[PDB]
Amino acid sequence: KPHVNIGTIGHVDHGKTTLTAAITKVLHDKFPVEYQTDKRHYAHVDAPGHADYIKNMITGAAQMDGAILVVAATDGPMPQTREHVLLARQVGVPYILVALNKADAVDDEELLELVEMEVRELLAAQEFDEDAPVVRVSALKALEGDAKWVASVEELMNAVDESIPDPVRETDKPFLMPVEDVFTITGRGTVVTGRVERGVINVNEEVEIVGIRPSTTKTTVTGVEMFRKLLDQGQAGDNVGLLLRGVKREDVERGQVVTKPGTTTPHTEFEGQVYILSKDEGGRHTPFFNNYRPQFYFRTTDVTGVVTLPEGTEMVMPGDNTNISVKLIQPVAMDEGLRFAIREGGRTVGAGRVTKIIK
Amino acid sequence: MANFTAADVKRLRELTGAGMLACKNALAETDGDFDKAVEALRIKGAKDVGKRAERATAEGLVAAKDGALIELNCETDFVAKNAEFQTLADQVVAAAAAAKPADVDALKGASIGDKTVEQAIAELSAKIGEKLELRRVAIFDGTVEAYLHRRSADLPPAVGVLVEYRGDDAAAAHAVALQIAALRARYLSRDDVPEDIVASERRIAEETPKIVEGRLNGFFKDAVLLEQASVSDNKKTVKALLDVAGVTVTRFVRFEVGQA
Ligand SMILES: [Mg+2]
Ligand SMILES: [Zn+2]
Ligand SMILES: [Zn+2]
Ligand SMILES: [Zn+2]
Ligand SMILES: [Zn+2]
Ligand SMILES: [Zn+2]
Ligand SMILES: [Zn+2]
């Protein structure tokens, strides 16, 4: 039932691709990209390059719930391996496991023992579990059908199943819905609409509405209406309208989030990781400097803020991937990790993700 | 393991940085003589570096020391941000800065210490398993301003600019550098544009008396540094601001990894 994102990282010559194909065949032999097991469906994410992996996680296009390091038993690790692992530590993949590929070609076992610990010290060097699963696999022999090796690929995928934890379900997180529209249904009160971003909401719970306006509002939801029928709860992912007790149409607006009280706080200054669209991607034609003032998109509405470049950054060019500080003109509901768009009058010119709140 | 231990193979790997199996093969190939095996690994390294010579090298960095500018290329940016690659780059640019080589092939044979720049690259190439290329070099004898630019904060600089100049407004020269780095100016003045590129662009305007003259006034404004609009203030022009600064630009260059 749960889907899980697992990156595969490693040297191209070591069989990164080949071992992925080997996994698909071995599982497709078992149950006659994406590959699934008993427990889970798995989603493959790649990391061909560090920087444009980082781009992709900023834009949300890529996230890893765990990662497989592919190291050739023949060679053992490489100087870059240090850097591959480093990517995982930096974006913060929760758990890593290693696939000693091409293990058929190492006739003396003392060498296979030996590359193990090399790889184990790199994982240890970098605050990953030192005694984490290291599996001996032969992608190319399993593809051929050698069951000794087919069994190893099965061993590796079984390793993924036990050792990568289940990801937290979005309905178990605290409730939050960004407001799209605000209407009054005559004689029933005002109703705020949107898509439940996470958590659940129930027909007579109490909620806080956060951001945009000067002061957070606290009230209770009086009806949860999907399509035009009234339900008892609204789940993460649902399109809903929430009737709010005694909250007049003019005291809520898009860009606000309705949340489970005390869980989210408005903010006005933050540090952030950004990727700036190139001219050939549709973005700025010119670089921007130290007193830039675009609008920051957030969840449902733009909020204007002033960029501050970090000490040592002269300029930001189109295509750049860097860090900034932002002071918004009005407060917006934000947590660390939150994704936002950088827009100039309504055209996205860049993509960012909040890394540290201030004030 | 015909005539040597496994600790013999660990060591031969710890010394050459080569592949565990390639080391074991190497020792058994010489039957345990350890010195012949080291030289045996050198042989395969050279074969394997050749085999990947036709590969593409679009990631890497640029380096500037004392008015020398180089671009060193690899396959992935994992290698570009690796310490052993940056140290090689540091070495090779310092080679270039001291020897002031005429062309790239001059810099290849320059000494880096106990080995040449070619050797040092080819030798690091084999240990990494990617193609490595010294792509281009630029040496300015005069007084220079350099600006190096990171396209991604946790990578090495991917755009580099030298600006050779006469003047005492140091900041004015540096400000130009950005302007070259940002706006990809191809020529310093109008005159410098080859006449066979002027026809190449005047002939595309026929495809598309005074409409020809307008296009060229435009494409001169794009691709000539002095005819561009200052990034700090597009009301004024590059040339205009230098005159106020009291700074004259003798020549400049801009390297970008992967781009031309
Ligand atoms: Mg892959
Ligand atoms: Zn699925
Ligand atoms: Zn299934
Ligand atoms: Zn455009
Ligand atoms: Zn043997
Ligand atoms: Zn030395
Ligand atoms: Zn300077």
Author numbering:
A (entry chain B): 10 to 41, 70 to 396
B (entry chain A): 1 to 208, 220 to 271
Relevant lines from the article:
To reveal the molecular basis of the EF-Tu reactivating mechanism in Mtb, we investigated the crystal structure of the full-length EF-Tu and EF-Ts complex. The Mtb EF-Tu•EF-Ts complex contains one EF-Tu and one EF-Ts per asymmetric unit, different from that in E. coli and T. thermophilus that is composed of two EF-Tu and two EF-Ts molecules. The EF-Ts comprises 13 α-helices and 6 β-strands, containing three domains, the N-terminal domain, the core domain, and the C-terminal domain. Similar to homologs in other species, the Mtb EF-Tu bound with the N-terminal domain and the core domain of EF-Ts through Domains I and III. Notably, the binding interface of EF-Tu was full of negative potential, while that in EF-Ts was positive potential, indicating the charge-charge interaction promoting the complex formation, which is critical for protein stacking. Residue R13 on the α1 helix of EF-Ts formed hydrogen bonds with P114 and E155 of EF-Tu, respectively. Residue N82 of EF-Ts formed a hydrogen bond with the side chain of EF-Tu E120. In addition, the N atom on the side chain of EF-Ts-H149 formed a salt bridge with the O atom of the D357 side chain of EF-Tu. When EF-Tu was co-purified with the wild-type or mutant of EF-Ts on the size exclusion chromatography, it clearly showed that mutants R13A, N82A, and H149A dramatically disrupted the interaction profiles with EF-Tu, indicating the three residues are indispensable for the EF-Tu/EF-Ts formation. The EF-Tu in the recycling complex (EF-Tu•EF-Ts) had a much more compact shape than that in the inactive form (EF-Tu•GDP).
EF-Tu is one of the most critical proteins in bacteria, as it is the only protein delivering aminoacyl-tRNA to the ribosome for polypeptide synthesis. EF-Ts functions as a guanine nucleotide exchange factor and catalyzes the reaction of EF-Tu from the inactive form (GDP-bound) to the active form (GTP-bound). The Mtb EF-Tu contains three domains, named Domain I (residues 1–200), II (residues 213–296), and III (residues 306–396). Here, we report the crystal structures of Mtb EF-Tu•EF-Ts and EF-Tu•GDP complexes, showing the molecular basis of EF-Tu’s representative recycling and inactive forms in protein translation.
